[PDB]
Design a protein around this ligand. Structure first.
Ligand SMILES: [Ca+2]
Ligand SMILES: [Ca+2]
Length: 279
């Protein structure tokens, strides 16, 4: 299948070279798999979700996304127009407040929640967890990320936006999960993107068009926008039966576009997420 005039990040992921505008993907599009978006919530009623999104847990007074960040991330994962895995099932876990902040204890609880909750859901092709959040190093936050990964969920986390070594940031520094860096439309490392040896792959993160609260759309940047491109790609590959939750990160790194990125510091991988679609 082909999505003509797709957002640059979608075209990039199904292309070997930058500058294309069609997103080519397998029509299965992630159906059968499930992606948990652990953020500010998701506006499930947004028409781009087609009834495929649902709030499953909140840690605040309401489960609605009063921020927009989570709705944005969920759109990149699987909205009709801005999503990587167009037929996936989206579940929202609200661990961040409407200002986009949350505490470590609530973020850890959200992760333990998903590890248990996936057992009452029908996700025959696999379960993915998308975490476009992070903070200063915390061993308990890293540990919650590792438990989720070991429970059988593909965990993808943002590298962080401090233009620094991701080793001092959490969930990012957890070596068992998939740490995602951001890139721009010219194949340059996003200027704000963290880097370092803990990163596993890079995804499109500069000026990413996606859904927003109030039934709208908005273009924003961050390693937070790169994370969902790889969570969505993992869900698509798992439903294709190419990989599993436990090895999806490694399979993505193995099949990525290698050496295409510029501004990659010595010691950071130069791997760009790629679906390897051939019609
Ligand atoms: Ca190339
Ligand atoms: Ca890793």
């Amino acid at each position: 299948a082909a999505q003509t005039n797709a957002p640059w990040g979608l075209a990039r992921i199904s292309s070997t070279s930058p500058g294309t505008s069609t997103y080519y993907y397998d029509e299965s599009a992630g159906q059968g798999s499930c992606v948990y978006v652990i953020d500010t919530g998701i506006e499930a009623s947004h028409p781009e979700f087609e009834g495929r999104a649902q709030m499953v847990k909140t840690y605040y007074y309401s489960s609605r996304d009063g921020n927009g960040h989570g709705t944005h991330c969920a759109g990149t994962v699987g909205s009709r127009t801005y999503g990587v895995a167009k037929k996936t099932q989206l579940f929202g876990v609200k661990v961040l407040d409407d200002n986009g902040s949350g505490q470590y204890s609530t973020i850890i609880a959200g992760m333990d929640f998903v590890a248990s909750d996936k057992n009452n859901r029908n996700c025959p092709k696999g379960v993915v967890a998308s975490l476009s959040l992070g903070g200063g190093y915390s061993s308990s936050v890293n540990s919650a990320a590792a438990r989720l990964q070991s429970s059988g969920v593909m965990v993808a986390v943002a590298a962080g936006n401090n233009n620094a070594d991701a080793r001092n940031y959490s969930p990012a520094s957890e070596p068992s999960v998939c740490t995602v860096g951001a890139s721009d439309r010219y194949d340059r490392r996003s200027s704000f993107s963290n880097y370092g040896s803990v990163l596993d792959i890079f995804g499109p993160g500069t000026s990413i068009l996606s859904t927003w609260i109030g039934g709208s759309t908005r273009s924003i940047s961050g390693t937070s926008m790169a994370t969902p491109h790889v969570a969505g790609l993992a869900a698509y590959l798992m439903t294709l039966g190419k990989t599993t939750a436990a090895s999806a990160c490694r399979y993505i790194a193995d099949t990525a576009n290698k050496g295409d990125l510029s501004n990659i510091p010595f010691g950071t991988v130069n791997l760009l997420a790629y679906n390897n679609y051939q019609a």
